[PDB]
Amino acid sequence: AMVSEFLKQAWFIENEEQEYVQTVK
């Protein structure tokens, strides 16, 4: 079978689940 774990997000990227480092306040 062919999975699309990378394609299921490659086109869909939410800011909430985006790549970013934690910055203090």
Curated annotation (Swiss-Prot):
Q: Where is this cross-link: Isoglutamyl lysine isopeptide (Gln-Lys) (interchain with K-?)?
A: Q18
> Where are residues bearing Phosphoserine located in the sequence?
S4
Residues with Phosphotyrosine modification: Y20
Q: Which residues carry this modification: N-acetylalanine?
A: A1
Q: Which residues form a coiled coil?
A: none
Q: What does the UniProt record say this protein does? A: Functions at least in part by activating the formyl peptide receptors and downstream signaling cascades. Promotes chemotaxis of granulocytes and monocytes via activation of the formyl peptide receptors. Promotes rearrangement of the actin cytoskeleton, cell polarization and cell migration. Promotes resolution of inflammation and wound healing. Acts via neutrophil N-formyl peptide receptors to enhance the release of CXCL2.
State the protein's name: Annexin Ac2-26
